[PDB]
Amino acid sequence: XVXXX
């Protein structure tokens, strides 16, 4: 966390 978590 879509930074890619």
mmCIF file of all heavy atoms in Angstrom, unseen atoms left out:
data_model
loop_
_atom_site.group_PDB
_atom_site.id
_atom_site.type_symbol
_atom_site.label_atom_id
_atom_site.label_comp_id
_atom_site.label_asym_id
_atom_site.label_seq_id
_atom_site.Cartn_x
_atom_site.Cartn_y
_atom_site.Cartn_z
ATOM 1 N N UNK A 1 0.912 -1.179 0.000
ATOM 2 C CA UNK A 1 0.000 0.000 0.000
ATOM 3 C C UNK A 1 0.948 1.226 0.000
ATOM 4 O O UNK A 1 2.051 1.161 -0.591
ATOM 5 C CB UNK A 1 -1.048 -0.017 -1.173
ATOM 6 N N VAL A 2 -0.924 0.592 -3.571
ATOM 7 C CA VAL A 2 -0.426 0.592 -4.975
ATOM 8 C C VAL A 2 0.737 1.597 -5.130
ATOM 9 O O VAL A 2 0.819 2.268 -6.166
ATOM 10 C CB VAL A 2 -1.572 0.658 -6.053
ATOM 11 C CG1 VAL A 2 -2.502 1.873 -5.830
ATOM 12 C CG2 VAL A 2 -1.137 0.626 -7.539
ATOM 13 N N UNK A 3 1.625 1.703 -4.122
ATOM 14 C CA UNK A 3 2.843 2.560 -4.189
ATOM 15 C C UNK A 3 3.841 0.299 -4.961
ATOM 16 O O UNK A 3 3.318 0.260 -6.078
ATOM 17 N N UNK A 4 4.262 -0.800 -4.305
ATOM 18 C CA UNK A 4 4.051 -2.190 -4.799
ATOM 19 C C UNK A 4 5.417 -2.903 -4.868
ATOM 20 O O UNK A 4 6.355 -2.534 -4.123
ATOM 21 C CB UNK A 4 3.043 -2.919 -3.863
ATOM 22 N N UNK A 5 2.364 -3.731 -0.442
ATOM 23 C CA UNK A 5 1.971 -3.239 0.883
ATOM 24 C C UNK A 5 0.937 -2.101 0.983
ATOM 25 O O UNK A 5 0.166 -2.068 1.950
ATOM 26 C CB UNK A 5 2.460 -3.759 2.029
#
